[PDB]
Amino acid sequence: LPYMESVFEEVFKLLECPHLNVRKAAHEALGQFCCALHKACQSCPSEPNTAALQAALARVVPSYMQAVNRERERQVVMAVLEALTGVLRSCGTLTLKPPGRLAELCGVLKAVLQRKTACQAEYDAMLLEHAGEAIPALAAAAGGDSFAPFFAGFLPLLVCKTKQGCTVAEKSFAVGTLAETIQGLGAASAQFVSRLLPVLLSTAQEADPEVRSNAIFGMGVLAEHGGHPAQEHFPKLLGLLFPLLARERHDRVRDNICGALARLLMASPTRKPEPQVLAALLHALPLKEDLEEWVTIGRLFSFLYQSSPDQVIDVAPELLRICSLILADNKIPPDTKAALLLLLTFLAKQHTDSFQAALGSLPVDKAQELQAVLG
């Protein structure tokens, strides 16, 4: 720590410099050093360490704010937007404590978005894409309820990049931005379900697999976080999302569709997951592209064992087929493994004839293999 303060103090002096990239790497460095300092304060929460960290944020963040609507070199502002996003991702709440810091940060982001800043053509698409990248980290940092009245104004500007006739990169970045922002909005995303659902419903009728994956992930996340206003459309969502699990080939979209269906089933209260639904989801499993969804699938497995068991027993072939090829894969979260084998030990110890009928057409070595751990 006595070494770090000299680094803040010396790097900060590089902003009174007339050279572009020096101010650039200065803002970059300050952001990375605040993130590092935070990660350090998390290993040993020494109250002077959190104190020193806040002392650093209170000067680095207003320097960014000052830089966006005053600095005339767009590249430097871009670097600032990346850095501020990195801080908003690492520190989160700690950056928004001083009253009005959220409202100000939102004001500066707004300024970049509608080109009302001091530094205002590839740097334009990138400036807007960076201020864009800063929305979901700020929503996550502030906790949705505090951030929603600004996302009301952010939403149109960000849906413009969704209208038919934009770059696949434009469309897809903006859409993924919206999904991430739903996640960061949490329960307050319920306010926006009506305005968002046409956007995800249309942008999943898109050719490129990146746009479709971002939009279907957006559907699942909206279903999970949207609450009661989202629940009204669950039959509609499942309606569009049940054909494509056989209609569609790009495996990334297969993965994000399985994820979206898991969010749906887990967030839909009444009754049990419809049989053909969970059946198709388990057919498309295991994932191959967006592996981050496995955690979700893990939860879903758990979800089953808690809400309904008199339905897992009929997808047991699928449910130990997935298992016998997903523990050699040491890139799968081990609590996802734990959930799936909790379903399995259920099926074995309480419904054995279905369990043995399910070990049926696995390979004999895979059968004995699954018999190794569980009795």
Curated annotation (Swiss-Prot):
Similarity field? Belongs to the importin beta family.
Kindly list the organism's lineage.
Eukaryota, Metazoa, Chordata, Craniata, Vertebrata
The HEAT repeat units are at 191-228, 232-270
Location of this chain's protein in the cell: Cytoplasm; Nucleus
Its biological purpose: Nuclear transport receptor that mediates nuclear import of proteins, such as histones, RPS3A, TNP2 and VDR. Serves as receptor for nuclear localization signals (NLS) in cargo substrates. Is thought to mediate docking of the importin/substrate complex to the nuclear pore complex (NPC) through binding to nucleoporin and the complex is subsequently translocated through the pore by an energy requiring, Ran-dependent mechanism.
Q: How does it assemble?
A: Found in a cytosolic complex with ASF1 (ASF1A or ASF1B) and histones H3 and H4.
User: In its UniProt entry, what is this protein called?
Assistant: Importin-4
**Source organism superkingdom:** Eukaryota
